[PDB]
Amino acid sequence: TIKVGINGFGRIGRIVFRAAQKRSDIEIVAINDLLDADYMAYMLKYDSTHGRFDGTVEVKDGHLIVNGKKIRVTAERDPANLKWDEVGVDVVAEATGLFLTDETARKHITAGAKKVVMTGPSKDNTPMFVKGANFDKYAGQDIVSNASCTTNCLAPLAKVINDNFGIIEGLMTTVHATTATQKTVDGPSHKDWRGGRGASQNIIPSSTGAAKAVGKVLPELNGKLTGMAFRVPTPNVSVVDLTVRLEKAATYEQIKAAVKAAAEGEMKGVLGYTEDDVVSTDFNGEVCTSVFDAKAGIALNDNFVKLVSWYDNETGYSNKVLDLIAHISK
Amino acid sequence: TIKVGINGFGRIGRIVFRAAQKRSDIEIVAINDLLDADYMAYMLKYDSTHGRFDGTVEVKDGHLIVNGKKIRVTAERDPANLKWDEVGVDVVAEATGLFLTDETARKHITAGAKKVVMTGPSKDNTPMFVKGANFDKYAGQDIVSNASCTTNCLAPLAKVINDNFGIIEGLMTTVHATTATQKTVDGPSHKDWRGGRGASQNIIPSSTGAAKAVGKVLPELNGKLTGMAFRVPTPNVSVVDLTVRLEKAATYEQIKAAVKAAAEGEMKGVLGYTEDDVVSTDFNGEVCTSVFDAKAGIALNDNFVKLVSWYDNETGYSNKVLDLIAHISK
Numbered sequence A, B: 001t002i003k004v005g006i007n008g009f010g011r012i013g014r015i016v017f018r019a020a021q022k023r024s025d026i027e028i029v030a031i032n033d034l035l036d037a038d039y040m041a042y043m044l045k046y047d048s049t050h051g052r053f054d055g056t057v058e059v060k061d062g063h064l065i066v067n068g069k070k071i072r073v074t075a076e077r078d079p080a081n082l083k084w085d086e087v088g089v090d091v092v093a094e095a096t097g098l099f100l101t102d103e104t105a106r107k108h109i110t111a112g113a114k115k116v117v118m119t120g121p122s123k124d125n126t127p128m129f130v131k132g133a134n135f136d137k138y139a140g141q142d143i144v145s146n147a148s149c150t151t152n153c154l155a156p157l158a159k160v161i162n163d164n165f166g167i168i169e170g171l172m173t174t175v176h177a178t179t180a181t182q183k184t185v186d187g188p189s190h191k192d193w194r195g196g197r198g199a200s201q202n203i204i205p206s207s208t209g210a211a212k213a214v215g216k217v218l219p220e221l222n223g224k225l226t227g228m229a230f231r232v233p234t235p236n237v238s239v240v241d242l243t244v245r246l247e248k249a250a251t252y253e254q255i256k257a258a259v260k261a262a263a264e265g266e267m268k269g270v271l272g273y274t275e276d277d278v279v280s281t282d283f284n285g286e287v288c289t290s291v292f293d294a295k296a297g298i299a300l301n302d303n304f305v306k307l308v309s310w311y312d313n314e315t316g317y318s319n320k321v322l323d324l325i326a327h328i329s330k
């Protein structure tokens, strides 16, 4: 199997670990953060969002013992000091959010790993890969990114709408749930003033280049999309609101048939389709990175439409990151 | 196999149905509320608090088919028009919060049912039974009550404490989750001015009879306890705060030992014991009606202490309701 090492036992680092348990190809051998193996264990055991860990976790000699398997624990602030090779790591999952450039994330390879997958969009030219978008373009690069959560939701959809009706232009808006970067009450966020204001108290307009990034994963769409976001008071799962102009006219019943078909075939396991009266909680724990909501979307006419799709920014993305690791190996 | 009908397909009505699916002695044969079989099916398929129904459900002829079995659907507002006997209903789970007196609840007997179990404390002399307190005092009555979610938490604990060191007097406080009786924004609640205030915006002081009621199911304690509640912005899982004076002096480590023993034996399944740094969400879906939080409790001296216990006001209570049903059914 593929020996995976995690750096940053955060929301993504933890959920990636949880979901990694229901996989036969990958296996977590080591974890790094800045905590004691007893706190790390408490963090894995209880989750306010996805409930109690489904298995056993014990602390022993400063390391974890999850499901009877020893997980090496470290608390090194610098990635270059991780000696991942002492534990046989193949690919490293960069979930800290501090190492999204090649020079930063490469410390993992010089530390003994083989490849690295950033759990966020790269900040330099490091290639981004999206399941159902361009996984087929991976060219053996040793450091890759899995784009963002919003992109993993918008790319698979735009792709289907473009392949059937051709997208002239599109403007996206994602209503996102709160994340670890926000504040409980109005506090400092000097890189983004709006993002520091009380999360649970407001609807916070926010920026995102997830729409622009779709043109980089699907070049055909390059430059045709852009958008923004609204951070709202929910602990998880968000939804994208894409308004596009189409080349080849089509009725909603027709747009519906297109998505459902992809959802049933090529985009199976990535793009989903539903006609139910769902709400955000119905997706807490969802593995499909994009679930089309037939009943929520709306069209002004056969060439101007607003489509809506759901994504559990935590589980969907975390599962795809693992897919990318399996993809780039061997 | 006990056949049961549910009156009021609400939060408790619905969780009871879900809990019953894992039991082989109980069988839900009919359901009544004030809605269509298709809305009923939606209410059951999707739950914001406990996830998507874990099984199959379909609508047919105007009734539902859940897990290969057919459930009769009615929308009768007057319980006496239910003809429970047409489907062979043994016991009915009164879950509307509207028929909590023998008079109103007896209509279910008039309608064909042989026994009734109100999911709320009786409004009259109707006998209340609480698992871990007075189940063994059931004397064949046809109409009983499972008390409240709060009394089902306090009674089991108050008994281990009484039996071990004797309780002279106690005052209780329950930090309770929001319920269907509350409102989204400041609205009319003619019978509880505070309860009508925006649930999500306030810490709402509320009165309880759960404390006194403990003396009714544990006569020894009669008159020695009383209390109040605080309604806070959470969707589920509450906790009781018991401050008591003890006859026999006991260290906190003595008290814990007693609880842990009753929990690991005599009260196993009703009262639980933990020493972890738990929070409310860690109990969403908990079956034990009272989980003692060792680490949260505080003692002023060997005769004056504050004890803490957690309870999923939805899942534990709904499970014990099925317990009482199984109990009175012999």
Ligand SMILES: NC(=O)c1ccc[n+]([C@@H]2O[C@H](COP(=O)([O-])OP(=O)(O)OC[C@H]3O[C@@H](n4cnc5c(N)ncnc54)[C@H](O)[C@@H]3O)[C@@H](O)[C@H]2O)c1
Binding pocket: A007, A008, A009, A010, A011, A012, A013, A032, A033, A034, A076, A077, A078, A094, A095, A096, A097, A098, A119, A120, A148, A149, A179, A180, A313, A314, A317
């Ligand atoms: N939150 C989401 O829903 C979501 C979805 C997709 C992608 N992402 C991306 O994934 C990354 C993970 O975000 P997250 O939500 O888990 O955040 P998080 O803050 O919950 O987790 C990050 C973890 O990094 C640890 N850490 C900090 N400095 C470290 C260091 N020097 N060495 C090792 N560990 C260190 C922190 O203690 C923390 O546990 C971010 O870059 C984010 O942009 C987040």
Ligand SMILES: NC(=O)c1ccc[n+]([C@@H]2O[C@H](COP(=O)([O-])OP(=O)(O)OC[C@H]3O[C@@H](n4cnc5c(N)ncnc54)[C@H](O)[C@@H]3O)[C@@H](O)[C@H]2O)c1
Binding pocket: B007, B008, B009, B010, B011, B012, B013, B032, B033, B034, B076, B077, B078, B095, B096, B097, B098, B119, B120, B121, B148, B149, B179, B180, B181, B313, B314, B317
């Ligand atoms: N909410 C809790 O956590 C909790 C815990 C223990 C006990 N209880 C008790 O259980 C009862 C259930 O409360 P709940 O939270 O499920 O409330 P709820 O409002 O969610 O459920 C009540 C259901 O009754 C239906 N109903 C109304 N009038 C009816 C009629 N004439 N005939 C049939 N159905 C009718 C409503 O449409 C609704 O679905 C209450 O009496 C409450 O005191 C509630």
